[PDB]
Each structure stands twice: as structure tokens, then as C-alpha cells.
Amino acid sequence: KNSGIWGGKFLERMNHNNPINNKPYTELDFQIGEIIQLGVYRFQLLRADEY
Amino acid sequence: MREIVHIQGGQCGNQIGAKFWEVISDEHGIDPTGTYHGDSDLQLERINVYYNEATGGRYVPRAILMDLEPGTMDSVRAGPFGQLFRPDNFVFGQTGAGNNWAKGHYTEGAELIDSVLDVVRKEAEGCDCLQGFQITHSLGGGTGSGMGTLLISKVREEYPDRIMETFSVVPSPKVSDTVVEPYNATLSVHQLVENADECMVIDNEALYDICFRTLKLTTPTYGDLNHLVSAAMSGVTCCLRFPGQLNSDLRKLAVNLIPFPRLHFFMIGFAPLTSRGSQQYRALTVPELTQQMFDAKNMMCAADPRHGRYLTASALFRGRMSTKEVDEQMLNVQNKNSSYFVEWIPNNIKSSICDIPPKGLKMAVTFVGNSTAIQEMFKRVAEQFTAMFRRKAFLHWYTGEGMDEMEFTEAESNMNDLVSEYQQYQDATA
Amino acid sequence: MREIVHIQGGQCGNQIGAKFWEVISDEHGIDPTGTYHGDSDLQLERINVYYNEATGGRYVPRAILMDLEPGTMDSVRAGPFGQLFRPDNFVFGQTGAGNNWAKGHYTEGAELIDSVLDVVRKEAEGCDCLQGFQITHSLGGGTGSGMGTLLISKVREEYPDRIMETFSVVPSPKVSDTVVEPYNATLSVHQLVENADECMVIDNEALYDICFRTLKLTTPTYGDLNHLVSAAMSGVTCCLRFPGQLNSDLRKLAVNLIPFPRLHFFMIGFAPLTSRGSQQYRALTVPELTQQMFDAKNMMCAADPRHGRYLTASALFRGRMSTKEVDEQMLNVQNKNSSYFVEWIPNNIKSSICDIPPKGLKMAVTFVGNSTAIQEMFKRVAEQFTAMFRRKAFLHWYTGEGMDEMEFTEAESNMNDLVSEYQQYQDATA
Amino acid sequence: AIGTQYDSRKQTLPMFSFGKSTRESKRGTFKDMMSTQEVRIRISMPKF
Amino acid sequence: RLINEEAEKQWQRQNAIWQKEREAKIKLMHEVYDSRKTDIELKQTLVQV
Amino acid sequence: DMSYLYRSHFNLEPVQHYVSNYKQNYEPKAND
Amino acid sequence: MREVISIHVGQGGIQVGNACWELFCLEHGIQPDGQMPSDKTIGGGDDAFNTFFSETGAGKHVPRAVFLDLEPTVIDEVRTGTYRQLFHPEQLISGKEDAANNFARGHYTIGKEIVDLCLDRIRKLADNCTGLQGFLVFNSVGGGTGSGLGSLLLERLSVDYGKKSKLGFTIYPSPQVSTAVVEPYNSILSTHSLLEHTDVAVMLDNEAIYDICRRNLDIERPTYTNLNRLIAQVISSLTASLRFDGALNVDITEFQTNLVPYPRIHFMLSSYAPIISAEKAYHEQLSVAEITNSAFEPANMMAKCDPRHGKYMACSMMYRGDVVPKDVNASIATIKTKRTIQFVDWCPTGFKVGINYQPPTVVPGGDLAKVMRAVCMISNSTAIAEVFSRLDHKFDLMYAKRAFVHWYVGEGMEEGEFSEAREDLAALEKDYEEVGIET
Ligand SMILES: Nc1nc2c(ncn2[C@@H]2O[C@H](COP(=O)(O)OP(=O)(O)OP(=O)(O)O)[C@@H](O)[C@H]2O)c(=O)[nH]1
Ligand SMILES: Nc1nc2c(ncn2[C@@H]2O[C@H](COP(=O)(O)OP(=O)(O)O)[C@@H](O)[C@H]2O)c(=O)[nH]1
Ligand SMILES: Nc1nc2c(ncn2[C@@H]2O[C@H](COP(=O)(O)OP(=O)(O)O)[C@@H](O)[C@H]2O)c(=O)[nH]1
Ligand SMILES: [Mg+2]
């Protein structure tokens, strides 16, 4: 709120693989605090949902 | 040398000052207890422009805060940087004016002005060599619109040759925060035209449109408004405080801007401004800066500059840039907009350069433009004022304090004459 | 060397002395038991001015305390530094005057004054070389206002050549506490003008306003009032007891402040005085000291100095300062306000410098101004006197013990003639 | 040395003038910075 | 510095008197309310008899 | 708390405090 | 350093003063005993309560109010209630004999012996204040004692103090629902008395707020306490800006200079929003646009009048909460654009706006719930002439046969006194229809 970036949907629904091992991402890779390289953007999984 | 003192009045004036001193203290690196902690050597060379020295090495602003109710000052003191202000410099009333120009210019302010004029005489006298005075006030509130203009009158009657600069907030009919705005607005402008060496107008509606459209921020606040005004104010006098290629102070702008003595009502603009999501997308270059100066939406006044013709323009740049790029861009714009520039005045753009940009910025610009387009707001306020006055609305609240309708008639006549004279040059040809 | 003895009478005068001697002892580093414990020996070079030496190495004030009531003397003996005083000089009556100037000047004062006159003549003849005498008293009370004046006349009758100084507290109509004040005030002034070489007038109302305004403290007391008065008294003779660039004793001031023999009623003031909260905001410089001493509100009298023109002014500076700033500030302030300075006397301000500042302050200033503005207090006191006198109110109390209305008429005539002659030089032109 | 001289090196000193504010020209407020800070204490109230 | 020690000492002695009158007033005030209380209970106790 | 309404929300972003005159320095000396 | 003094006269005035003084004490944190909690330890402070209270130097706080009545039942109930420790024991002025809905009794017979003590107390209370902002007066108009004592008090104060501002919060009798049968006579006389002696007067008729409670609070069985709570909340909304910090501060003196076209026209009608029960308050966002719409639909009016039947002169609005001026401007633009609301031609602008930060409080066990935004509006419009017309018809139907006239004649009032009141009401109607015509 009250900062004004034109935020929204950043990447669309699409499926792509990890560049190092050339294998598609699975549930095992998505662990909290891991680093995932989606295309060129690297993300660190800070917190997860209770579900 | 050539320092200036600060005088502010009214709630809007005090709110403007609270952020103006905030931004100037940030620029000069002064902590809220008043002790220097800056990095550069230049930051202390020209301190005496706005600050006085005290024992123990502290700095005190040379500003005087006036208002007819104590609540506004009691609130502004408690905020950040509120302890800098000298406690003796607060001047105030115990009752207030209640948006009544008659009360704020005839009955109560006349009695109160003794102390404030004494202290302003003291502060002006103590300075080494005076340059001029700046005032910040709103034309929508009675106490401000009366006390400020009456103080302007008396201070002019004491300092005929020094320069006076007035930052006037005029009420647009869209955001009409008071139903009696036309009366005191016209009464204020009638006295202001005869005395103010310079007046620059600011519109809350235009500020709101700019904040919503350019910054793309959802819900603006009066803090953001005061921040815009503070940046614009600092841009004008940065030259007076810092070295540059072409230093150009208030007297320079005054002599170089006004073709005729009674046309001293300007509208201003600032650049650059963008959201952080586009802050890295943009490329900070002189063509971008000039595009943003002369864009219509950048002006913080409701007047549309394309509905009239500029008498003159002035731009002050901050940062390091070449004189060639500035001059060539100015010439290119003056040639591409030949229609909107009055023909009988050759080369009607002034340029100035300062090597020290605002903190965090690589380049910046403050723009002051004098054009015939501001007649629209005068015509609108005149229409609203005559709509009120033909039926004698609200009139007894003003006439009960020794003021009569002859003054109203004279003020309306003078403002109408100003509008007609101001459009006279619009169609003048050589 | 060339010292001066101290005599006090009446409740107000005794309370003044109780703080004057205490502050002098603080300045000279003397304990309440009379044994030196100071840090420097400059404090002992001119200790002969006020203090006599006794076997056992102790120092004592040369003060004569005289009264018609023992209550005040008994109360002041129990206070701090109350043991310094010689028990012998305490001379007091058994009945009291009842605020009756007749009773305190004709019946009991005359019979009692033999002993106090004997002791004062002893103190005078014992000394090496007499400078003069100084008195502190109030004119609103019968016993002081009568017996002090009778002592003045007597002492003058045996010492025609010595300098005679009095601090008179006159009753202002604002702070009025005795209904018979005008009668005794006029009767006392009639005698004072003919004998006192110097008189300085102090008003409780003015002190009260100073305490409320510049010190910004809600609940002052007589202790604080006495503190201010005592500091003012000490500053007059500081340069006599201490070296400086331009020493100037009381005879110097008498020569340089008296145009005509009968115009010897001054009003005094002290600088700087600032609130505790703004103590560290202020910067102490000679311009600050001069603008504060010349301020109207700082003056210890109720007379408004800008309602008239100064005849002569005198400034006593304390601290480490050079003659440039002092002299040029005097010249510049006299030039800028030539309307308030009489014209047929050029350069009507005297300056003097002493090197030792008051304990705790780096710089200090005592201002003494002989101006024609004091005519207002005379006019008011004479108006109240004649208003009470038309109906012969309270007159039987004075007529029952030796005097008649002829002396009252003579005193009123002399008082009015003094007013007329004092105003005569105001409108005079060269 | 005894008047007004102009140069970037050496300054001009001030020349004050007496003000025209009366002895009682109103204006108050801001009792937070006083010397006394009048005494406030706590006592419980009886139940009558 | 030497100025500042003297100023501090002056301020200390001046503050001492204000302090003294302060405790004098506050004990007086406590005595005032303690004397106020001790009559209302007498009134109630007299009501029963 | 009213911090959501008091202060501004503006971000506008060292060794930039030297005069344009500081291009003037040093430069040592180089028949029949 | 800003203070106002409140007068509560009449039984309705006392019963609404109870509600308002509950709310202010709850908001400022003073217990019913009058002493603030020793656990909170405020320490050194001022302002806030200073607007309504006066400090005892050490301890409890005395509200700057005075209660006036001739029938002692309500005052006895207050003095035996839980607030017996708060109010002063000699500021609750009570008589012995009630006026019994007789305006003549309360204006000429028994009020004269009480008005002296009332004025003495008023002078004593005013001598304490130094920045007196004004007077508030509360009185039911359909009651003899309330009307007569209020008229006499205003008449005396107008000459005793002169230019000080006074605000009158009157509860006019409803069009068809009424309690007694003699309200028209004393109502007309009281309006005649107050017309030239009150600076601003507000409408507080009953059926309007009754329908408000029926529709919004979903209370089928309301009593006077709920109505008093509503009026108290309105008073808090009006007076908040004096004692709480806000971006746009508005004083009580900022009303007669912004809402009164001519000295004769000073009767106004108010609305408040939101009024929502806790069971459904949290189901909606309660944003500024819909709340300021709710402030204007005629159904939520606190006066039983239709604004659609006439033109507007001026609307002054107070917002409290986290509202922002951009949203305020956006809402005002839509209101102006709306075609079902008409403003008068000689007033192209008619809006006065004030903003304050502190959200309204709730009374535990009350009806309203916690809402972070609220708006209270005061409007002066030409539609109010309908109530004057209907009471004129009511009074004429009665004065035609001179019924009940002896009950006023036998108490010292001149017979033709009703006549000049009638011509004054006719003149007021003429002034209204005169200012209602365009140019
Ligand atoms: N809003 C509101 N109106 C009330 C209340 N109580 C009484 N009234 C109105 O007051 C009118 C009569 O005046 P009251 O206030 O009851 O009594 P009074 O003003 O003291 O006059 P008397 O009955 O003669 O003593 C009735 O017609 C009611 O409409 C109340 O609690 N709230
Ligand atoms: N930019 C800005 N404008 C303000 C501020 N406060 C008030 N105003 C404007 O001032 C006008 C009312 O002025 P007012 O407060 O009555 O001035 P006063 O009568 O001198 O106190 C309104 O239209 C506001 O738009 C502020 O903090 N910033
Ligand atoms: N400075 C000062 N003046 C005082 C004090 N007590 C009384 N006065 C002044 O003395 C005047 C009364 O003088 P009075 O005591 O009757 O003099 P006496 O007749 O000689 O004893 C009053 O107007 C007071 O203003 C005090 O403690 N200090
Ligand atoms: Mg009743």
C-alpha cells in the first residue's frame, strides 16, 4: 500500500526445467529457503503457507 | 553574505515550513539537535544563508512562525526536527480569525502585529547583508490571507529595495475546502499585486493530479504535497548556496523574468519525477529533463499553458552537464514551439546551472514560467466572487468589523483591470 | 582604599542588604564565618572596599543596620551569612512608625538617630580615605521613607564633599500595597532631591514583569527580586574593586551623567538575562549584550524610555573584551536612533570596561540611563497625591504630630516644578 | 573602521533599533518550559 | 571549561532551593489530605450512634 | 500509530561534492 | 487553552447530558469517580481533557457543565447514581415546583428566582477559563420549563457576554407523533425568543432518529438511552477537532462564518454515518465513497424533512478516522456530479471539510460497533421551511378558538404575545421563500 508500483502477475503459468541438471523441477526442489532459478530470475523461498 | 530570513504564517504556512526546513537540513547534513555531521566541505561554506551560529557550535534557523491559534505550532514542534526552531520566535493569537479576512486584517492581527514585526525587524537587522524575504501562505484561509498580506505591506513600507518572494496557495473551485474562499482570495490578491515583488502560485488540485498520475502512488498525503513544495523551493535558491557555472540569485530572476511591474504571478515545475518501478527504466538525460519540464501535466498549477502564450521562461539545472547541451535543447524547444511563445520578445528563455545536485540525484531541474495562461484562474475566482457578491452572501460577517462594500468594489475592479491588462499583451503583435 | 560604607534602614532595605552582602561575599570568596577560602588572591587586593579586618584574621562588612522595629533584624540575623554583621551596629527602636512619615521623621526618628549617627561617624573617621556613602531603601513605607531621608540630610550636613548614593524603591500604582503611599513618596522625594547626589529608582512592578517575561519562571519571590537588585548594585562598583581597561568610579559616573545639579534620578538594568531552557541557545556577543541592555522591557523601571529621549547613558562592561566593539556599538546605536537621543549634546553615552566578569558568566553589562521618560512616574504620583489631598483624607494623622498643610503644599509645588523643569529640556532644540 | 565597509573578506556589524512592542502586548502559551513545573501528586479519594 | 564549572555550580545551588520548597509543599499537601480524611469517618461513625 | 500518514514515501537515488572548478589543478611542468 | 461551557436545561437535556458525559469521560480515560487510573501513570500532561474538564490541582476533574431543572427527580437520580463522585454538589441546580409544560410559568413566574443562581454559577465557571471558545446549550423545546429557562438564559447571556458564540441543540416536536398536547404554543414562543438570540441551532426531532434506529441498528424496541447515545456521538464528532490533532482543524467559531448566509437563517439539519450493528459491521469495508453517500441519502437524515423538496445553501462535514483528502475530493466530485442533489445558484461551491485522525470510540454494552472511519455532516438548506409551515398550521388551528389560552394568560403573559410570534414566523417563511428563488 501507498508506494505505487504497477505490481501484478510477474510470470505466467508455464513449465520449465532447471538449467544445471536439465531436469524439470519437482516437489523435492521446492523446499523452504532453497534457491530456484526460474529462467534468469533466482528466488529464495522465505516462508511457506501453513497448508 | 546575501542571506535571507524565513517568515511563515497560517496553518498551511507552518506545515510548509516544517518540511522546507526538514529538506534543507537534510541537504546541509544537520542532525535534529543542530550539530554538524556532514561529509563534504562545501556543505558548511554557505551555511549562514539560512542558519545562525550559537555557542557550542549549534545552528538555529532564522525563521519566524506566526499563527492566531496555538494548536498548529504545538503540533509542529513535537515532530522531527521541531527542536531546531528558536522557542522565542513563535508568535501567536489566543482566539483565531475563523477564516475571516476582516478579523485577520483589521481587528486582531492589527493588534498582534507589534510583537511579530519587532522580532522580524530584529532577525533582519542581525543579518550581515540582506538579500530578501520569502513568505509561504495559503489564500484560502482568512487568518493567513490577511495577516500575511498586511505583514507584507508593512515590511515593504520599511524595506523598499529588498526583494520579496511569496508562495501563495490559491483555492481551486474543485477542491474548495472553504465556502468563503472567493472573498478573502480576491481581497488578498488585490493587496498582493501592489506589494509582492514575486508571487508564485501553487494549486492543490494540480499537486493531486501530479501525485496520482506521474508517481502512480495510490493515496497521496499532505506530507507528500509538502515534500513536492519543499523540493521546488530548494531548487530556486540552491544557486544562492552552492557554486555553479552560472549563479543566478533572486534579484537576477526578478529582473530577468517580469516584463512589466504588475505581472509578477508565476507558475513553477520540478523534474524529474517517477515511480521506482520506472526509476531504472528511465535514462536521466537533458532531453528527458526538458521533455518533463515543458510537459503540461508537470506544472503544479491548474492553468493550462497551451491555452495561452508564454511571455518568458526560466530553467535552473542541478548537477553536472555541458552548457552546449542545455543551450541547444533550449533553442530547439523555442523553435519547435513558435506558436506558444509571444513573438515580440526574442530569445525569451533563461538558463542557469548549479554543479551540486539534490541529495541522491544526478541531475534535476526547477522551472519558473510566466505565461498569459494564468488568466483562467483569475476569471474563475472573479466569476465565483461576483456570484457570491450580487446577492450579498455572507456579507455582514465582514461588514460588522468596520469594512464596507466599497473596498469589495475596488478590489473587484482592480482584479478585473489586471485580468484585462494581462490578456491585452496576449494578442499584441509587432 | 577610597572605600564606601553601607547603611540600610527599613524592611525592604534590610532585605536588599541581606542579599547584597551575600552576593558580594560569594564574589570575594568569603565563607559565612568570615574566613577566606577563595581560589585567587586578586580577591584580596581591594577587600578594603567593603570589609574591615579583625583580630583573628576575619573580615566583616562595614554596614550600619537601623530600624524602628526589631522583628526584621531578628529575622535577618538567623539567615545564612547573618553572622558577618557586627552586633553593635544593629540599632532599632521599640515602637515603630506605622507607615507614618511624620512619626518616622519628626518624633521617634529624631530622638533615635543620635546613636546611629554616632556609629556611622565612628566608622567614617576610622577609615583611611572616604569615597562616599550608599543607602538602599523604599519610599512606600513610613519608617524608611522618613528616617533614611533625615539621615541623608544629616550626613550631608557633615560631609559636604563626599558622594552620596541612594537606591529608592518607589511605589508604582500597579503593585500598590499601602493606601498612604503617595503622601510619603512625595514628602521623601522633596527631601531627597535637595541632598542626594545620585538616586536610582526601582519599581516592583517592573521587576515582576522582568521575572515573568525574560526569565520565564512562574513563581518568583522576594529572594529572586533581591538577587537581581543586588547584582545590579554590585555591577556599579565592580570596576572600582577590580582592575580594567578603563576604570571609572562613582565620581566619574557622577561627573559624566549629570547635566544639571537637580537631574539625578536614574533607571538601571542588567544583561544578559535568559531562561534556563534558552540558556544554551543564545550566543553571547557584544551586539547581543547591547541590544538586550537597550531593550525597553529589560529596564528596571516602569517608565517607557521611548516615550522620551535619553539625556545621558552609561554602560559598565565586565569580561574580556576589546574597545573596538564597545565604542563602535555605542556610536552605531546612537546614530540609528537619533530621534530618541537629545541633539544639543553630542556623543551622550559613556562606556567603561572591567576585566573580571561576574562569577559564572563570561560577559556581563550594567546599563544606567538618565532619560526624560521618568516624568511619567512623577506625574502619576503627584496626581494620586493631589487626588487624595483635595478631600483632606488621612491628613489628620500627619497633622497631629508637628507638621501642617503648608509643608505639604510646598512639597507639591517643588515636585511639580521639578516635573516642569525636567520636561523643559525634552523639547529644547539647538 | 567605524562604519559600513563592503568586501567578501570583512563583514558589516549590526545596528539595532528599539522595538515598539508594549509592556503588556499579550502572547502567552507553552508552559511546558517553565522553571517551576507546579507540583502534582497522587492521593486516593475516600468512598464518602 | 572554567566558565562552565562555575555556571554548573550556580545552577546547582539555585536548584537546591526549588527542590527544598518542593518537598516542603508536598509534605504540607499530604498533611492537608490526611487531615481532610479524618473527619468524614467521624461523621459516618456518628451516624450509627 | 499514524506513521502511515505522517511522513513522505519518496525515494530518489557519494563522491559528487566537488566543484566544476576542480578541472584546474597540478599539471606539472613538461649562418653562412 | 481552549475551552467550552455546556448548559443542560430540561429533562431531555439532562438525559442527553448523561449520555454525552459518559462518552467524553470514557474517551478521555477518567473513571466515574472522577480520578484517572493510578496504574496508567499519565504523569505530566495537559490539553485533551482541558477542553471539557478543569483540573483540581491534584486529582479529580470537574466537567465544565451545569445542569438546570425545576423537577428534582432526574437530578436526584444522578446524585444517587454511579456518577455521584464526578459532578460538583452545588452545580446541579434543581428547583421544587415543575413548570408543567407551561411556558408562561417557566418564563415569567418561577424561572426568575433560579436564573440568578444559574448566572452566578456561569460567571464562576467562566472566570476559571481563559481561552473560552463558546457555549453549548441543550434543551427540549416541547417542554415548558426547558423552553422558558433556555429562552431566559439566552436573553441574559446575549447582554452579559455579547459576542461569544453559542450553539443550540434543540429537539423539535415531531410532525405527527407527539407526547403532550400543548407543544405548539410553547414551541412557537421559544422559536420567536431564540431566533434573534442563538448563533446556530440544530434540528433534533424524534421520528427521524427513531426510524434510523429501526432501519440500521435493527432495534425494534428502542428507548431514550439509544437516542441520547446517538446525539452524544454526534457531539463528539463535532468537538473532536478542538482536542485532537488533525490535518484540517476546524473550530466552533469556523461555523457562523461558513454556514450562515444571512443573520436570520441559522437553523440546520444534521446526519451521521455509519450506524451499523457489530453483527454486520465487519462484513463490509465501509469505505469513504459509500460512507459519504450514506451521509446524504434522505433516509439517513436526523431530521424528518426531505432535502429533495428544496435547495441547499451549505454543507459542512467532519471526518474522523484514517480517511485521506484524495478520497474526500473524489467523493465530493461524485456528489456534485449527482443529479438528485441541487445547490443554490449563488453558491457554486458549498462544501466545508474537516479531517481528524482519532477514530470514534465505542461504549461497551452499547449498540454501535468499532468502525475506523466516520463522517458527520451539517447542512443548511431551504427544505427546512416545511416544519415551520406545519407548526404554523398547528398553531393556527388552536389559536382560532383560543383554547388553553387562560393557562397562559393567568400567569402574567400579555394576550397579544402570540401574535408577534406568528408574524415573526410568517416573516421567516417569507425570508426562506425569498432566498429560495434564483436570480
Ligand atoms: N430526544 C429526546 N427527547 C425527549 C426525551 N425525553 C423527553 N423528550 C422530549 O421532551 C418533550 C417534553 O419536554 P421534557 O424534556 O420531557 O420535559 P421538560 O423539558 O423538562 O418540560 P416539563 O415536562 O414541563 O418539565 C417531549 O415531547 C419529548 O419529545 C429524551 O430522552 N430524548
Ligand atoms: N500543501 C498544503 N496545503 C495545506 C496544508 N494545510 C492546509 N492546506 C491548504 O490550506 C487551505 C486552508 O488554509 P487554512 O488552514 O485555513 O489557512 P489559515 O486560515 O491561515 O490557517 C486548504 O484549502 C488546504 O488545501 C498543508 O499541510 N499542505
Ligand atoms: N525587594 C523587596 N522589596 C520589598 C520586600 N518586602 C517589601 N518590599 C517593598 O517594600 C514596600 C513596603 O515598604 P515597608 O516595609 O513598609 O518599608 P518600611 O516602612 O521602611 O519598613 C512594598 O511596596 C514592597 O514592594 C522584599 O522582600 N524585597
Ligand atoms: Mg419536563
Short mmCIF file of C-alpha atoms in Angstrom, two decimals, chain B residues 145-349:
data_model
loop_
_atom_site.label_atom_id
_atom_site.label_comp_id
_atom_site.label_asym_id
_atom_site.label_seq_id
_atom_site.Cartn_x
_atom_site.Cartn_y
_atom_site.Cartn_z
CA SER B 145 -4.68 35.60 3.75
CA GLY B 146 -4.99 38.65 6.00
CA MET B 147 -2.02 38.55 8.34
CA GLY B 148 0.45 37.60 5.61
CA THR B 149 -0.61 40.35 3.24
CA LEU B 150 -0.71 43.00 5.97
CA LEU B 151 2.75 42.00 7.16
CA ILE B 152 3.89 42.17 3.53
CA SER B 153 2.53 45.71 3.34
CA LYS B 154 4.32 46.93 6.46
CA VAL B 155 7.59 45.14 5.70
CA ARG B 156 7.60 46.65 2.21
CA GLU B 157 6.98 50.08 3.72
CA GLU B 158 10.19 49.50 5.71
CA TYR B 159 12.41 47.81 3.08
CA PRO B 160 11.58 49.33 -0.31
CA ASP B 161 14.59 47.97 -2.23
CA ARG B 162 14.93 44.43 -0.87
CA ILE B 163 13.28 41.60 -2.77
CA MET B 164 10.11 39.89 -1.57
CA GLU B 165 9.02 36.42 -2.64
CA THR B 166 5.61 34.95 -1.83
CA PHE B 167 4.47 31.34 -2.19
CA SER B 168 0.70 31.58 -2.48
CA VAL B 169 -1.63 28.60 -2.27
CA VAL B 170 -4.77 29.70 -4.11
CA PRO B 171 -8.06 27.76 -3.76
CA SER B 172 -9.21 26.00 -6.86
CA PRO B 173 -13.01 25.63 -7.07
CA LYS B 174 -12.66 21.86 -7.47
CA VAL B 175 -11.04 21.29 -4.06
CA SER B 176 -12.95 24.05 -2.27
CA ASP B 177 -12.09 23.49 1.38
CA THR B 178 -13.91 26.65 2.49
CA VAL B 179 -17.13 28.24 1.26
CA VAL B 180 -15.86 31.81 1.72
CA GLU B 181 -12.69 31.31 -0.36
CA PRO B 182 -13.50 33.83 -3.16
CA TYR B 183 -13.96 36.77 -0.78
CA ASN B 184 -10.66 36.58 1.08
CA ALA B 185 -8.85 35.31 -2.03
CA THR B 186 -9.78 38.40 -4.04
CA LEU B 187 -9.11 40.69 -1.08
CA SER B 188 -5.69 39.07 -0.67
CA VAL B 189 -4.68 39.26 -4.33
CA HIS B 190 -5.72 42.92 -4.52
CA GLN B 191 -3.24 43.81 -1.79
CA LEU B 192 -0.63 41.33 -3.04
CA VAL B 193 -0.41 42.72 -6.58
CA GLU B 194 0.71 46.14 -5.34
CA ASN B 195 3.36 44.87 -2.90
CA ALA B 196 4.78 41.45 -3.83
CA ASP B 197 7.96 41.62 -5.89
CA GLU B 198 7.39 37.98 -6.85
CA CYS B 199 4.48 35.65 -6.27
CA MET B 200 4.38 32.00 -7.34
CA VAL B 201 1.08 30.16 -7.17
CA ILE B 202 0.52 26.54 -6.15
CA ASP B 203 -2.65 24.52 -6.73
CA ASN B 204 -3.68 21.59 -4.54
CA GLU B 205 -5.68 20.09 -7.41
CA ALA B 206 -2.64 20.12 -9.69
CA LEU B 207 -0.48 18.63 -6.93
CA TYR B 208 -3.08 15.89 -6.53
CA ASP B 209 -3.23 15.15 -10.25
CA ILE B 210 0.57 15.00 -10.48
CA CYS B 211 0.86 12.71 -7.46
CA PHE B 212 -1.79 10.37 -8.85
CA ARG B 213 -0.65 10.34 -12.49
CA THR B 214 3.15 10.62 -12.51
CA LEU B 215 4.19 8.98 -9.24
CA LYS B 216 1.50 6.29 -9.67
CA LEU B 217 1.14 6.20 -5.89
CA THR B 218 -2.30 5.25 -4.64
CA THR B 219 -3.25 7.60 -1.78
CA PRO B 220 -1.24 10.83 -1.56
CA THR B 221 -0.87 12.72 1.68
CA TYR B 222 -0.26 16.28 2.80
CA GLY B 223 3.24 15.11 3.69
CA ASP B 224 3.86 14.25 0.05
CA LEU B 225 2.39 17.59 -1.02
CA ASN B 226 4.69 19.46 1.35
CA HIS B 227 7.58 17.35 0.06
CA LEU B 228 6.91 18.42 -3.53
CA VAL B 229 6.68 22.05 -2.46
CA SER B 230 9.88 21.72 -0.42
CA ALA B 231 11.85 20.30 -3.34
CA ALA B 232 10.55 23.08 -5.59
CA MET B 233 11.50 25.72 -3.02
CA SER B 234 15.01 24.33 -2.56
CA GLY B 235 15.55 24.26 -6.32
CA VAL B 236 15.14 28.02 -6.64
CA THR B 237 17.71 29.03 -4.02
CA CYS B 238 20.22 26.19 -4.45
CA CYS B 239 22.19 28.61 -6.63
CA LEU B 240 22.45 31.12 -3.79
CA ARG B 241 24.05 28.46 -1.57
CA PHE B 242 26.24 26.45 -3.93
CA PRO B 243 28.73 27.36 -6.67
CA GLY B 244 27.85 26.80 -10.30
CA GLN B 245 28.60 27.65 -13.90
CA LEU B 246 26.03 30.49 -13.93
CA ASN B 247 24.90 31.51 -10.47
CA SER B 248 21.63 33.43 -10.68
CA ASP B 249 20.03 34.66 -7.47
CA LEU B 250 16.63 36.12 -6.66
CA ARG B 251 17.41 39.60 -7.98
CA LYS B 252 18.66 38.03 -11.21
CA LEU B 253 15.43 36.10 -11.69
CA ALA B 254 13.30 39.10 -10.71
CA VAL B 255 14.90 41.50 -13.18
CA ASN B 256 15.05 38.87 -15.92
CA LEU B 257 11.50 37.49 -15.60
CA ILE B 258 8.94 40.31 -15.38
CA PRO B 259 8.39 42.48 -18.48
CA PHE B 260 6.12 44.88 -16.60
CA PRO B 261 5.77 45.84 -12.93
CA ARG B 262 2.27 44.44 -12.36
CA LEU B 263 2.84 40.99 -13.94
CA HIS B 264 4.66 39.02 -11.24
CA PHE B 265 2.50 35.89 -10.84
CA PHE B 266 4.40 32.78 -11.90
CA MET B 267 3.75 29.07 -12.02
CA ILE B 268 6.55 26.60 -11.38
CA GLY B 269 7.53 22.99 -12.02
CA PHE B 270 10.08 20.38 -10.96
CA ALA B 271 11.82 17.46 -12.64
CA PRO B 272 12.46 14.54 -12.67
CA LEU B 273 9.68 12.53 -11.01
CA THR B 274 8.93 8.82 -11.46
CA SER B 275 7.99 5.66 -9.61
CA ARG B 276 10.81 3.36 -8.53
CA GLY B 277 9.42 0.71 -10.87
CA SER B 278 10.21 3.10 -13.72
CA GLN B 279 13.09 4.84 -11.92
CA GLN B 280 15.64 2.50 -13.51
CA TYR B 281 13.77 2.25 -16.81
CA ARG B 282 14.21 5.98 -17.36
CA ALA B 283 17.51 7.38 -18.61
CA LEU B 284 18.49 10.64 -16.94
CA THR B 285 19.41 12.93 -19.84
CA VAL B 286 18.92 16.58 -20.74
CA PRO B 287 16.32 15.79 -23.45
CA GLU B 288 14.33 13.83 -20.87
CA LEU B 289 14.61 16.72 -18.42
CA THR B 290 13.35 19.26 -20.95
CA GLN B 291 10.52 16.98 -22.06
CA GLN B 292 9.41 16.76 -18.45
CA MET B 293 9.80 20.50 -17.80
CA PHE B 294 7.61 21.62 -20.67
CA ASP B 295 5.01 18.87 -20.39
CA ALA B 296 1.69 20.44 -19.43
CA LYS B 297 0.89 17.97 -16.65
CA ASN B 298 4.17 18.69 -14.82
CA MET B 299 3.07 22.19 -13.76
CA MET B 300 1.60 22.29 -10.28
CA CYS B 301 -0.94 24.94 -11.31
CA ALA B 302 -4.39 24.37 -12.76
CA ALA B 303 -3.69 26.77 -15.64
CA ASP B 304 -3.15 25.03 -18.97
CA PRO B 305 -0.08 26.64 -20.60
CA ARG B 306 -1.21 25.66 -24.11
CA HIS B 307 -4.30 27.88 -23.80
CA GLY B 308 -2.07 30.96 -23.73
CA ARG B 309 1.34 32.23 -24.75
CA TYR B 310 4.47 32.32 -22.60
CA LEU B 311 5.87 35.76 -22.01
CA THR B 312 9.07 34.16 -20.71
CA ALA B 313 10.57 31.04 -19.20
CA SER B 314 13.44 30.21 -16.86
CA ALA B 315 15.11 26.91 -16.01
CA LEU B 316 17.65 26.16 -13.28
CA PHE B 317 19.56 22.90 -13.57
CA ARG B 318 21.23 20.95 -10.77
CA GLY B 319 24.10 18.56 -11.38
CA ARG B 320 26.97 18.48 -13.83
CA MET B 321 26.14 18.92 -17.51
CA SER B 322 27.56 20.71 -20.54
CA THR B 323 26.42 24.20 -21.43
CA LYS B 324 26.12 23.22 -25.09
CA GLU B 325 23.52 20.53 -24.49
CA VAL B 326 21.41 22.86 -22.34
CA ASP B 327 21.57 25.77 -24.78
CA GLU B 328 20.90 23.65 -27.86
CA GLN B 329 17.92 21.94 -26.22
CA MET B 330 16.53 25.34 -25.20
CA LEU B 331 16.92 26.69 -28.73
CA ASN B 332 15.38 23.54 -30.23
CA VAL B 333 12.33 23.77 -27.97
CA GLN B 334 11.95 27.52 -28.59
CA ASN B 335 11.96 26.84 -32.33
CA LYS B 336 9.61 23.84 -32.18
CA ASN B 337 7.02 25.76 -30.09
CA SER B 338 6.99 29.03 -32.03
CA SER B 339 3.21 29.31 -31.70
CA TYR B 340 3.09 29.26 -27.89
CA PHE B 341 5.82 31.90 -27.44
CA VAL B 342 4.99 35.57 -27.90
CA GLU B 343 6.85 36.83 -30.94
CA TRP B 344 7.87 40.38 -29.99
CA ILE B 345 10.31 39.17 -27.32
CA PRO B 346 13.42 37.49 -28.77
CA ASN B 347 15.13 34.59 -27.00
CA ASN B 348 12.75 34.54 -24.04
CA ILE B 349 14.25 31.62 -22.08
#
